[PDB]
Amino acid sequence: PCPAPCSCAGTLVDCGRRGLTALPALPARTTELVLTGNNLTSVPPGAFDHLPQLRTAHLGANPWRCDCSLTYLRLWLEDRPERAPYRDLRCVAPPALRGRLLPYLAEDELRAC
Ligand SMILES: *[C@@H]1O[C@H](CO)[C@@H](O)[C@H](O)[C@H]1NC(C)=O
Numbered sequence: 001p002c003p004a005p006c007s008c009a010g011t012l013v014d015c016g017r018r019g020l021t022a023l024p025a026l027p028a029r030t031t032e033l034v035l036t037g038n039n040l041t042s043v044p045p046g047a048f049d050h051l052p053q054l055r056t057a058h059l060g061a062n063p064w065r066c067d068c069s070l071t072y073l074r075l076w077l078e079d080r081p082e083r084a085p086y087r088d089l090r091c092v093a094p095p096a097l098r099g100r101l102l103p104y105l106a107e108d109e110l111r112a113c
Pocket of ligand 1: 018019020038039
């Protein structure tokens with residue numbers, strides 16, 4: 001069962017440029033998720049918690065709001081080395097953090113959302 005707007009191949013789910021504002025329902029066996037070029041501003045805490053085999057998430061070219069709602073996503077991206085190449089998300093919001101990369105924001109800048 002592959003999510004309606006997306007395309008699937010094996011355990012990979014490609015939702016690249018489908019104009020998504022939220023996550024679709026994902027198969028529990030998903031190992032890779034292509035979310036490049038959508039309209040996501042954040043993902044809810046624990047969004048990938050039911051995807052135990054998720055190894056890779058492509059998240060670039062989304063309008064990320066870099067506030068306290070992005071705490072979970074940052075923690076996911078920062079946990080282990082193999083996620084490093086996909087980790088450099090660019091903030092577009094708030095205007096104070098526009099153009100900044102997520103990994104190098106001091107807690108100071110993210111806490112006070
Ligand atoms: C993505 O957001 C933009 C506004 O910046 C607009 O084109 C539309 O709401 C969304 N795109 C698609 C393809 O749905």
